[PDB]
Amino acid sequence: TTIVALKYPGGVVMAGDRRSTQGNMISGRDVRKVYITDDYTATGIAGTAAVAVEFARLYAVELEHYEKLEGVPLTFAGKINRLAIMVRGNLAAAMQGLLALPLLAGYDIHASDPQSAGRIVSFDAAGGWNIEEEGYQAVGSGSLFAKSSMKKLYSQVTDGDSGLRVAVEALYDAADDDSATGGPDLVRGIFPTAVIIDADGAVDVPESRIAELARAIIESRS
Amino acid sequence: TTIVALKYPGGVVMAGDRRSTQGNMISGRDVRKVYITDDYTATGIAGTAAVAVEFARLYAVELEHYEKLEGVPLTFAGKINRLAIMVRGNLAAAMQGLLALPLLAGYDIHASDPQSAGRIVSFDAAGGWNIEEEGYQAVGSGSLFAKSSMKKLYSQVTDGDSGLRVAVEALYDAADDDSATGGPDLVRGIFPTAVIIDADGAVDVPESRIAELARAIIESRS
Amino acid sequence: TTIVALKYPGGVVMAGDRRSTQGNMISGRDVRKVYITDDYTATGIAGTAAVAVEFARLYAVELEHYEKLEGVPLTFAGKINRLAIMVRGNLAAAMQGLLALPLLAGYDIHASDPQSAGRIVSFDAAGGWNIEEEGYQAVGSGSLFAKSSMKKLYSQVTDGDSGLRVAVEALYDAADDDSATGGPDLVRGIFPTAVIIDADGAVDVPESRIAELARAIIESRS
Amino acid sequence: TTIVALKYPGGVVMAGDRRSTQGNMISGRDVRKVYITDDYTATGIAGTAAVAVEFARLYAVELEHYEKLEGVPLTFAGKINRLAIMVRGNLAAAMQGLLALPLLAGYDIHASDPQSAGRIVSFDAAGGWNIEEEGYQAVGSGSLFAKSSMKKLYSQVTDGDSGLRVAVEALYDAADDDSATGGPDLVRGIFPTAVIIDADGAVDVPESRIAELARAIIESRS
Amino acid sequence: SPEQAMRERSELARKGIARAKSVVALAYAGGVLFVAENPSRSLQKISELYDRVGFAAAGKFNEFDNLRRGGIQFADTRGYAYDRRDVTGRQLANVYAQTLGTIFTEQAKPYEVELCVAEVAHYGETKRPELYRITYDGSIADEPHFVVMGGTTEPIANALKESYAENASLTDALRIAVAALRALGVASLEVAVLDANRPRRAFRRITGSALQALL
Amino acid sequence: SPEQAMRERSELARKGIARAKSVVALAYAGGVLFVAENPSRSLQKISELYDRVGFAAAGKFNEFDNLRRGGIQFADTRGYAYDRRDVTGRQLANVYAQTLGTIFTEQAKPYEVELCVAEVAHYGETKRPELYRITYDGSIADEPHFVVMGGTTEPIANALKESYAENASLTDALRIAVAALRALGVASLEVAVLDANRPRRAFRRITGSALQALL
Amino acid sequence: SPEQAMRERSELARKGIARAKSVVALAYAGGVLFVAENPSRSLQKISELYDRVGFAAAGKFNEFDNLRRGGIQFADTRGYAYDRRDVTGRQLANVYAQTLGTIFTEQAKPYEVELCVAEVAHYGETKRPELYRITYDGSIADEPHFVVMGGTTEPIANALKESYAENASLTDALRIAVAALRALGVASLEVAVLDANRPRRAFRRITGSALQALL
Amino acid sequence: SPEQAMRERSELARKGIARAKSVVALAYAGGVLFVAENPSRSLQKISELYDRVGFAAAGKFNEFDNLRRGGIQFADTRGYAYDRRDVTGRQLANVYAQTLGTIFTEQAKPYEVELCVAEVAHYGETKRPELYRITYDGSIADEPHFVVMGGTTEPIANALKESYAENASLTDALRIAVAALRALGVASLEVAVLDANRPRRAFRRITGSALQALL
Amino acid sequence: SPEQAMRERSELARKGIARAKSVVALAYAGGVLFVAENPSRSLQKISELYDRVGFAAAGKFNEFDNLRRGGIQFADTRGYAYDRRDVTGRQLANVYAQTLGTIFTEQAKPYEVELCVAEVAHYGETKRPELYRITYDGSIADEPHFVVMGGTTEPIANALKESYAENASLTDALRIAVAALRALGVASLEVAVLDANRPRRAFRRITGSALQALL
């Protein structure tokens, strides 16, 4: 599994792959790994497949519960603290074989400059969090290749289309260098899933755009 | 990681580096490790990165809670006792892989001679504390090199500028002799962080002064 | 570490060294190891440095608490029983690496003969106590050398000056034969600390007398 | 350590040695191991030195508490049962390194024949007790030699002097054959301690008689 | 008003105990003899507590039955903790007094019972037998000669006082017991003795043709 | 009869609060100003709850002291659980209302106290300060201008209503506060403010020569 | 006498609820509309329980606030245990009825509150909205058209009955709501709706210039 | 009305203690002498608490027996925790005062007892013996010469005050004790002393022919 | 009727405290002086709480003894948790006020005691000594000059007010203390001082020939 996220002027984008594997045998082909937690945040969890779906659902329930109870949504720091506590509380389960590595992307509506209101937060095993300042981050078993690809491709990002294209290219490279990550499926018609967050909110990217970008990249690489 | 502290006539200064490492791979580049706990104290924790941020926040909350409850701030001995208890209560976690080594620097406003009101306190693994009388102390994985550098460079300290310069030089030597400690970054523009405490209070040192001192040291060493 | 105690007609004297060591590296140079518990008793604890400071403070608090509650001080046997219980309650911590070996010296004001009212009590690991009748005792990692020196030097003790001189000489021999024990520091000016208890009470010995005695011994040994 | 006990017409006598040892180093020279529990009983405990003093004090407190509560003293069988329960309750501590082996001697005032009212009781590790009928018993690390000596020397006992002499001789043989047992000290003047129980009660034997007997035995053996 | 409540409880207990039959206990040469008026073979008012201790009571059956069971349980534990010869009737009397006092003070309804504890000397020894009486509120007293509880005690007490004789035999003392209670054949009579000539256990019941022959 | 008991408790609380002195709180250009009549330097009626929340009360000291300690403990935990900027005075007012209602309903004697909670905007922002009032039985109300509790409120309320002016300065509003309370020098006066120009903590006390210069 | 105590509690609750203001809830073409008389912006009487369930109450604030919090906590757990679409307003009404009955029976003072639960159909479906009413003693009833609680209900009930019209629009039904409550501008008015055309969450508040334009 | 209940409890306790017999305790050259009127050999009113502390009481047996057992248990634990020479009678008197006060305040029926604690100097030392008196409600007082409790104290108090003499011998002080109590042979008399010449334990009983010879 | 019960408890406490003797505490140049009327050497009314804090009380001994023990236990724990110099008398006064208020509210019988807490400056510093007074119901007040509790306070209060003088010496202030209490030799007098010139512990007792020489 591999999930990438990067910042562009005016928003932030996230993407992930669709492959599930039990050892060396492929057991999943259309797994979704990116979720819309609230109106302005998205989460992506890597690791054991069973734990991630539970994790995201618990996180969304917690945020909605606080919103309904207090009548006002939490600040970004509060959300980061809640996620960090949730990650910290799973150390024994991770030791016994249930590991979850989350990635957070969001848009801060209470900031000063609207063109730099996007945030990317990464977490460690112990429960420490860091706010990215380079503009991109990746998690999973093929995150090194995707990060190395983004390091070279980040200079071309100016808007929401360039960021999506760069994310798709990074996912393609990660699938190229790692067998646990699934690449685009042309025979079946399965493509990665992406989410874009801007001043209007978090929206899902239609499959047609991702298919067009993947076809362009594949024909370019030939 | 490496944090240094030394005394000059009329105050005390602290400084630290910015590198985070997971084994042999660099994962952090602008980590802050020195915090202002209250108006007249500063704390620096070395070890696991996740534990230190939690540790400092808990310590500050405890001090503010006592201040609000009793209407008067604690004495220096009370703060030392609270920090020692907090360190002693983490022995099992340190055994299982969560170790924190704190360093304390402060200015005593209830002393007799104002020119020698600065204090430096070091802690051991068991929970014992000692008040330094030589005038300097260092913690981290490169503390030996920094201490050996300060032992030779301490004769030049007469005021707040000389102490800052000596601290920067000691950090430079520690980064030179240890790979887990990060040196000044000229390509990116990242420099160590410092805090100065005097009779007026604890203030943060602007980055321009540290950059100028680092450039002077680097050109001197060439 | 090494702490010695001996009896002279009309009182009792205690002394200790100032060195702290973490393995083979010197980490302390002016550590105090002898405390005045109440008006007529003194205590010295050897072993882990962190545990001793906690131990003495707890013991003093307990004695003062009983004095305030009942309006009369405890007898000597009661103090011995309390100290023995405190030592016995730390067996598991000693097993896991927190060992404390205490030494007790005091003056009994409810005795018959005032010239033999001094007492020295030693403790074992299990929690058993014994009242010395030979007139001297030593604890620490260099106690054997100090005891062997006192066995030969005890014939010269007639008053409070001879006992202090013999104690300083025994500490000098213990530092000579053991590297974990620190000898007199002529370059820095650090000397052992001593306490004298007589019919008037327990008093601290000024550093000038100890420095003079150490200089006399050093020039004699040259 | 070694404690012996034997019966003579009209009473019973007990004796023990004075040496304490930590491995192969002598740490005690005047240790007392025989106690008067009540008016007509005596107890001697072998094993760890710390546990025995606690054991005897607890036993005496229990007996006095029952006497005060009910207004009548316990019978001999009740005392044996209490001691057996106390021994049985220490099995885990004996496993972890705190072993106590007690010996009981007493005079029964509620018997028929006053000339055979003396009793000797021995205990095992599990907590079983047995009343001796041969007339003598010994406990400690040199009990075999003392028992073998008494087996040959018991024919000469007719009164309280012969029994004391035989006990001293048995202790001498036990010290001769075992290094953990201390013999008479002629240079320092330290001799074993003995207790005699008869129809009048339990009394301590003055040191002069024991010294005279030891000198007679030593000159006889030369 | 605590005084009024204490008065009501005391009258309730007195009226409760005034209804029941009478049971007497006297000391003779061989030990202690218990005589009671009991029409039932199944339900018994006299029992054994330990080797040398006897039990007797009057009032409501379900209350002194519980008291007897508690006393037996208390007696058995002590003889295992210390010894069989360390158990005396004074301790049992004290325990009963404490229990009755607590019940009278705290319970909603006081117990309408009257207890008596008797003890005899051990085998081969000499000693005067002891008799104790425990009252529903916790009062304890020691009697040298006899105890009478239940019904109208005063005429029976006067008859026993007038016709008492020390060191009497079994038939003799039994005859004054029966005569004083009459002021009654094999049926409607319960008889038990504490025999001090027995080796270990001193309690035995006299029933059947032996009671007919003795009386 | 629950109605009668509620009536007695309500009169008890009203008579208890009618004895104490008066304390006022009004909003000015810089924030919120507290003025109280306090002869003691040691015992204080105005305190700080959090970074932007103030506390004030009237009645018995040992009761609102406990309430203040509970409020501080509640405030500190929340800022560690979520964040420092997620703490608002409305939550503290609700907690106080629940606590006072429970105490009034269940405790043997109701608390004779009257509380008030004030909050100000964060640094660099604009917002109208909020004032809440909590009554001994659990009633909670929101006031836009000022709150007066303790003693005879009505004349002071009328004076404050007549002479109130928005966006006043510190000396001005302090002078109407003192005049309305008079209807009082450095001693027997407690003055505190919630300054909205401070970076982090908005609470500070005005005592000594500064109070003399201001008034 | 349990009858007398029940009578006193019932009169206490009735007198408590008779003091408060009035709040109405009626069903229109788009869903359910809530109109309440509330001078305060801070303290709110209408809230949201779940995706398709609304909340409304009258009486003392600190009581129905606790009830609303309990209902929200109950609703959130069920949707995690089974699913979000397995939560219905009937279950919440039953829980509220049980809680109010237990409080009325056992607590020292009954709650002086009156609750109402409203639900609407899911997105893309058709169904008649449901309205429930819960009374301080635990009584539960179902209303097809409207619920009026608080103050003097009868004149408002008559006006609503006379002027009610099904399948009305938002402005229309809002105008009869305001007119019946009058028998009131942007201030001192709380308005909320359950919109059945929304994808997931049906609750939204109408405040500010939109309320002025609509009314 | 707490005053009325306190009055009733106080009269109940006073009437309870007014029934019992009298016991006196006076200090002579050798220590402290206890004289009591006790027809029973089995049940005892004077006992020993520790090495140098004595016990004496009047009233109901089952109450001060429990008090004596509690005191003995308290005394034994302290001498193991610290030492045998750290136990003084003042601590026992304070413990008894606290226990009696708590029982009087909280229990359903107060204890009808009156206690007295006596202490003597250690062996080889000199000191004036101390006498304390504890009253059913928790009051504690210190007496220098003698304490009289039980029955009608005033005539006995007057006789003891008139005929008291310091540094008297055993026969002398015993004779005034007997004469004052008379205002009594070997039987119906309990006599005990605290001998200050003994090495360890100072308590011993005088019974049998020795009492006849002394008196 | 809670008002009636509060009245009865208040009169009970007032009548209880009106019986006891009087104790005064005044501040002089060297610190604070305590003078009390105590016939007993053994039982003491003035004690020490910490290094710079003193204790004094009037009423029933077994109550303020418990209060003193609780205060000492509270003081010792805090100095181990934080430091010896972080302990102040205001905290102890607050703890005593809370304890007395809780006892008055909930216990069956209120405590008939009156407490006073005094503190002095540390060694080498200057500060005005502080005096606090705690009343049986939980009321706390601060006094600048002197505190008088027990018996009829008013004449003693008037005498002390008329004859008070600041910065007096020990003999001087002691003489006004004795004269005001008289409105008394070495016996029946307890005297203690809080000396501010001592290094660590400021409490010492003046007894024997020194009291005779001073007075």
Give chain G as a 3 state SS string: CHHHHHHHHHHHHHHHHHHCCCEEEEEECCEEEEEECCCCCCCCCEEECCCCEEEEEEECHHHHHHHHHHHHHHHHHHHHHCCHHHCCHHHHHHHHHHHHHHHHHHCCCCCCEEEEEEECCCCCCCCCCEEEEECCCCCEEEECCEEEECCCHHHHHHHHHHHCCCCCCHHHHHHHHHHHHHCCCCCCCEEEEEECCCCCCCEEECCCHHHHHHC
Contacts of F145 (CB under 8 A, 6+ apart): F26, F27, F131, F160, F164
H80 reaches D (C-beta below 8 A): yes
- B69 to F72: CB separation less than 8 angstroms, yes or no: yes
Q: Which of E132, E98, E95 is nearest to E115 (CA)?
A: E132
- H72 to D64: CB separation less than 8 angstroms, yes or no: no
| H3 vs A19: CA distance, rounded Å | 84
Identify each DSSP E strand in chain B by its residue range: 2-8, 11-16, 20-22, 25-28, 34-38, 41-47, 100-107, 118-123, 129-131, 136-140, 193-198, 201-204
- F81 to A74: CB separation less than 8 angstroms, yes or no: no
Taking CB atoms and an 8 Å cutoff, what residues of chain C touch D48?
126
H95 exposure class (CB count in 10 Å sphere: 0-12, 13-18, 19+)? middle
Please count the helices (runs of H) and the strands (runs of E) in chain E.
6, 10
C77 reaches H (C-beta below 8 A): yes
**A:G CB pairs within 8 Å:** 15
> What letter represents residue H124's amino acid?
G
- For strands A25-28 and A20-22, give the pairing: antiparallel
Taking CB atoms and an 8 Å cutoff, what residues of chain G touch A69?
69, 72
3-state secondary structure of H30: coil
- F90 to G8: CB separation less than 8 angstroms, yes or no: no
C-alpha angle H21/H24/H25, rounded to 5°? Answer: 150
- B49 to A127: CB separation less than 8 angstroms, yes or no: no
Taking CB atoms and an 8 Å cutoff, what residues of chain C touch D50?
124, 126-128
> What letter represents residue I211's amino acid?
L
| G190 vs G187: CA distance, rounded Å | 8
Q: After which residues is chain E broken (C to N over 2.5 A)?
A: 183
| G17 vs A5: CA distance, rounded Å | 56
Neighbours of B211 (CB within 10 A): 16
- C130 to D28: CB separation less than 8 angstroms, yes or no: yes
Which letter does DSSP use for residue A185 in this model? B
Distance from CA of C133 to the nearest CA of D (A): 9
Q: Which of I202, I205, I166 is nearest to I53 (CA)?
A: I202
Distance from CA of F168 to the nearest CA of B (A): 30
Side-chain half-sphere exposure of A220, counting CA atoms within 13 A? 9
Using CB atoms, which residue from B124, B128, B133 is nearest to C30?
B133
Taking CB atoms and an 8 Å cutoff, what residues of chain C touch H86?
74-75, 78
Distance from CA of H112 to the nearest CA of E (A): 13
Q: Which of B196, B195, B143, B193 is nearest to B173 (CA)?
A: B143
- B50 to A130: CB separation less than 8 angstroms, yes or no: no
CB environment D76-108: b (16+ within 10 A), e (fewer): bebbbbbbbebbeebeeebeeebbbbbbbbbbe
* Mutation for A interface: F80, F86, F88, F94, most A CBs within 10 A: F86
I208 exposure class (CB count in 10 Å sphere: 0-12, 13-18, 19+)? exposed
Are H and E touching by the rule of 3+ CB pairs within 8 Å? yes
- H101 to I43: CB separation less than 8 angstroms, yes or no: no
> What letter represents residue G191's amino acid?
V
Are G and C touching by the rule of 3+ CB pairs within 8 Å? no
Taking CB atoms and an 8 Å cutoff, what residues of chain G touch A65?
72, 76
Cβ–Cβ < 8 Å for I72, C69: yes
Task: Using alpha carbons, list the distances in angstroms from residue B37 to B55, B137, C149, F73.
Answer: 11, 19, 52, 20
**How is E2-25 classified by DSSP, letter by letter?**
HHHHHHHHHHHHHHHHHHS--EEE
| E127 vs E145: CA distance, rounded Å | 14
| H4 vs I17: CA distance, rounded Å | 18
C-alpha radius of gyration, chain G, whole number: 17
Q: Dig out the tokens for G140 from the structure.
A: 């539960």
- Domain range list for chain A: 1-222
Which letter does DSSP use for residue D116 in this model? G
Interface of D with C (CB under 8 A): 22, 28, 30-31, 48-51, 53, 98
The DSSP bridge partners found for residue A41 are A38, A106
**F:G CB pairs within 8 Å:** 33
- List of chains touching C (3+ CB pairs within 8 A): B, D, H, I
- G72 to A71: CB separation less than 8 angstroms, yes or no: no
| I31 vs I45: CA distance, rounded Å | 19
Contacts of E40 (CB under 8 A, 6+ apart): none
- List of chains touching I (3+ CB pairs within 8 A): B, C, F, H
Using CB atoms, which residue from D57, D64, D69 is nearest to H69?
D69
Are G and D touching by the rule of 3+ CB pairs within 8 Å? no
| B18 vs B6: CA distance, rounded Å | 19
Cα E191 to chain centroid distance, Å, stands at 12
C-alpha radius of gyration, chain D, whole number: 17
Q: How far apart are the first and last CA of chain I?
A: 53
Side-chain half-sphere exposure of A221, counting CA atoms within 13 A? 10
Contacts of B220 (CB under 8 A, 6+ apart): none
- D75 to E83: CB separation less than 8 angstroms, yes or no: yes
Neighbours of H128 (CB within 10 A): 9
3-state secondary structure of H107: coil
Are F and B touching by the rule of 3+ CB pairs within 8 Å? yes
Considering the segment(s) C1-222 as one domain, its CATH architecture is 4-Layer Sandwich (3.60)
- I83 to B77: CB separation less than 8 angstroms, yes or no: yes
B77 reaches I (C-beta below 8 A): yes
- A78 to F82: CB separation less than 8 angstroms, yes or no: yes
Cβ–Cβ < 8 Å for C196, C13: yes
Cβ–Cβ < 8 Å for A35, A56: yes
Which letter does DSSP use for residue I114 in this model? E
- A71 to G44: CB separation less than 8 angstroms, yes or no: yes
| A134 vs A156: CA distance, rounded Å | 14
CB environment H36-61: b (16+ within 10 A), e (fewer): bbbeeeebbbbbbbbbbbbbbbbbbb
| E125 vs F128: CA distance, rounded Å | 101
Q: Of these residues, D1, D2, D37, D41, which one is catalytic?
A: D1
| D116 vs D198: CA distance, rounded Å | 11
> What letter represents residue A105's amino acid?
A
For B187, the enclosing helix (H) or strand (E) is: none
A95 exposure class (CB count in 10 Å sphere: 0-12, 13-18, 19+)? exposed
| E111 vs E12: CA distance, rounded Å | 9
Query: Which residue carries 């004697």 as its tokens?
Result: F109
Taking CB atoms and an 8 Å cutoff, what residues of chain A touch G44?
71
| B159 vs B161: CA distance, rounded Å | 6
Contacts of B43 (CB under 8 A, 6+ apart): B34, B35, B37, B56, B59, B83, B102, B103, B104, B105
A219 reaches F (C-beta below 8 A): no
Task: Using alpha carbons, list the distances in angstroms from residue F82 to A105, C191, H80.
Answer: 19, 54, 53
| Residues of B belonging to the active site | 1
| C170 vs F112: CA distance, rounded Å | 72
> What letter represents residue H177's amino acid?
A
- For strands D100-107 and D118-123, give the pairing: antiparallel
Identify each DSSP E strand in D66-217 by its residue range: 100-107, 118-123, 129-131, 136-140, 193-198, 201-204
- List of chains touching G (3+ CB pairs within 8 A): A, F
3-state secondary structure of H118: strand
Q: Dig out the tokens for D179 from the structure.
A: 């290094």
3-state secondary structure of B32: coil
| Residues of A belonging to the active site | 1
| Structure determined by | cryo-EM
The DSSP bridge partners found for residue I56 are I46, I116
**How is A70-90 classified by DSSP, letter by letter?**
HSSPPPHHHHHHHHHHHHHTT
Strand ranges of the sheet holding I113-119, from the earlier edge strand across to the other edge: I46-48, I53-59, I113-119, I130-134, I140-143
Cβ–Cβ < 8 Å for A175, A220: no
The DSSP bridge partners found for residue D203 are D196
| C102 vs C134: CA distance, rounded Å | 19
| E71 vs E92: CA distance, rounded Å | 7
Distance from CA of I1 to the nearest CA of F (A): 7
Distance from CA of F79 to the nearest CA of A (A): 9
- F72 to B68: CB separation less than 8 angstroms, yes or no: yes
Query: Which residue carries 């939109």 as its tokens?
Result: G210
Q: Where are the alpha helices (DSSP H) in E20-88?
A: 61-81
| B36 vs B34: CA distance, rounded Å | 7
